[PDB]
């Protein structure tokens, strides 16, 4: 079997192998020009073959989101897409993957050797990967957006990137040997915090059966479309102008203008909004009325997910802990020093870290997950604390992507723990475990195996804990944030 596929828009030529790869597919028009801030269009159909074997362009983002990538450069030219299956897979054959990465909505690109999808699709699934718009060219609000706009509304366009990425999928997989009745949905960090604001979202009915939601950021502020719209005139009151304005000096000027620190109060300089179309109210108000989608849902976190977004501000002394405090919560910093005392248990660092961890990621992970309990949704729910028998350190946030994808890959961020010489064999025996649980997932909604017992989360909290020595095992019930927070 050629690495020959025909999409809806025309055939395409990717690489060939046990598994074959396809690279750079479009799936929409380019986002250029007058198409800028508009919602994804269909793109163009072409004649003959189309060459597939090298990466698209990533889309614009902050740059330290892209070292390591493997595309060829940069452009707003950038809604593409990549699958990897099993080679000789016939129509309808796999399920289906499709991976969102995460950059903090400013940043990312699926070209990462470490979302290589091949490891994934040699156990018998289809990968997809693929880019969609980010920073301010991929969330942002306007009036004159929104007048244009069929719906009246503006931003989110990179949710709609997502969106527009699984109706693809939707069309083309059994083309490539993939079942869309048997597509799961999988990101992380920020991807994840899309995948879980999509489910309170009308707009992804019928587009996945299932949902991993890696490290979601989720039940945070998030800004009103009347307040990002306001922003965004202030940026420039004339649309026009900045329609004409090149990528770049766009992108570094509204990069000029975030804050150097983290505020976690408010929403984040560049995300998804309240915008009424994709995301008609916040996702704490959907979970609070049930605006859920009951998918299959596996979600969880790691350890200390906070200790990835320390900074180098000095944070030493009980006065640098005290001073942090003050600064972020105002006259509660009293309070909160009392639901994370500096009594000698952590240091100042660790305190931190569990404060911001819980706040960005525990906290909405627990409401998500008791939600979809309360829906009726078949919900699991893990922990990956790592492999901290050689004196590791509890794996913090990112840690555990080399654990599902399988690429043992250092990243650039310095996320990815373990020794110079390479993983342990605890660590890839962690990952085929986990690995193979996630394709379990995929196929049939079910992350247990004969090897693995798991429980739902609706069964007594279980959780899976993806533990020391290449071990996971349920603890029932599962992790819990204080409840003084």
């Given at each position: 079997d050629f690495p020959v596929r025909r999409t809806d828009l025309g055939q395409v030529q990717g690489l060939a192998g046990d598994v074959m790869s396809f690279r750079g597919?479009?799936?929409?028009?380019?986002?250029?020009?007058?198409?800028?801030?508009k919602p994804p269009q269909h793109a163009r159909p072409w004649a003959g073959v189309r060459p597939a074997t090298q990466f698209g362009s990533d889309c614009f983002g902050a740059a330290y989101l892209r070292?390591?990538?493997?595309?060829p450069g940069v452009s707003e030219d950038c809604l593409y897409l990549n699958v990897w299956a099993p080679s000789g897979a016939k129509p309808g054959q796999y399920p289906v993957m499709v991976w969102v990465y995460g950059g903090g909505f400013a940043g990312g690109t699926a070209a990462m050797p470490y979302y290589d999808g091949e490891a994934l699709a040699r156990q018998g699934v289809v990968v997809v990967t693929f880019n969609y718009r980010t920073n301010i060219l991929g969330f942002f609000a306007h009036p004159g957006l929104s007048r244009e706009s069929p719906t009246g509304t503006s931003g989110n366009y990179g949710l709609l990137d997502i969106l527009a990425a699984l109706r693809w999928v939707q069309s083309n997989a059994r083309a490539f040997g993939?079942?869309?009745?048997?597509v799961t949905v999988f990101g992380e960090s920020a991807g994840a915090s899309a995948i879980g604001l999509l489910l309170t979202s009308?707009?992804?009915?019928?587009?996945?059966?299932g949902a991993i939601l890696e490290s979601p950021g989720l039940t945070r502020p998030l800004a009103t479309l009347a307040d990002s719209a306001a922003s965004g005139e202030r940026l420039d009151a004339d649309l026009s102008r900045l329609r004409s304005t090149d990528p770049a000096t766009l992108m570094a000027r509204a990069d000029a203008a975030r804050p150097a620190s983290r505020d976690l109060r408010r929403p984040r300089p560049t995300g998804p909004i309240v915008?009424?179309?994709?995301?008609?109210?916040?996702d704490s108000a959907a979970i609070a009325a049930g605006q859920?989608?009951?998918?299959?849902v596996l979600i969880g976190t790691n350890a200390d997910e906070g200790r990835a977004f320390?900074?180098?501000?000095?944070?030493?002394?009980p006065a640098d802990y005290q001073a942090y405090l003050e600064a972020q919560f105002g006259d509660q910093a009293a309070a909160v020093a009392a639901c994370?005392?500096?009594?000698?248990?952590?240091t100042p660092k660790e305190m931190v870290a569990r404060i911001f961890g819980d706040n960005q990621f525990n906290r909405g992970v627990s409401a998500f997950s008791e939600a979809l309990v309360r829906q009726g949704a078949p919900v699991w729910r893990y922990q990956f604390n790592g492999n901290?028998?050689?004196?590791?350190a509890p794996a913090t946030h990112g840690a555990e992507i080399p654990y599902v994808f399988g690429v043992f890959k250092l990243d650039e961020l310095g996320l990815f723990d373990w020794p110079p010489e390479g993983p342990t064999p605890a660590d890839r025996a962690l990952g085929q475990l986990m690995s193979s649980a996630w394709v379990r997932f995929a196929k049939?909604?079910?992350?247990?195996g004969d090897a693995l017992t798991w429980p739902a989360?609706?069964?007594?909290?279980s959780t899976m804990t993806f533990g020391p020595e290449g071990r996971a095992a349920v603890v029932s019930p599962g992790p819990s944030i204080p409840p003084c927070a």
């Open positions: 597919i479009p799936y929409a028009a380019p986002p250029v020009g007058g198409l800028r801030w070292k390591g990538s493997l595309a993939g079942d869309p009745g048997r009308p707009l992804s009915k019928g587009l996945f059966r915008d009424g179309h994709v995301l008609p109210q916040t859920l989608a009951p998918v299959r320390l900074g180098r501000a000095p944070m030493e002394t994370y005392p500096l009594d000698g248990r952590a901290t028998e050689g004196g590791r049939n909604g079910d992350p247990a989360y609706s069964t007594g909290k």
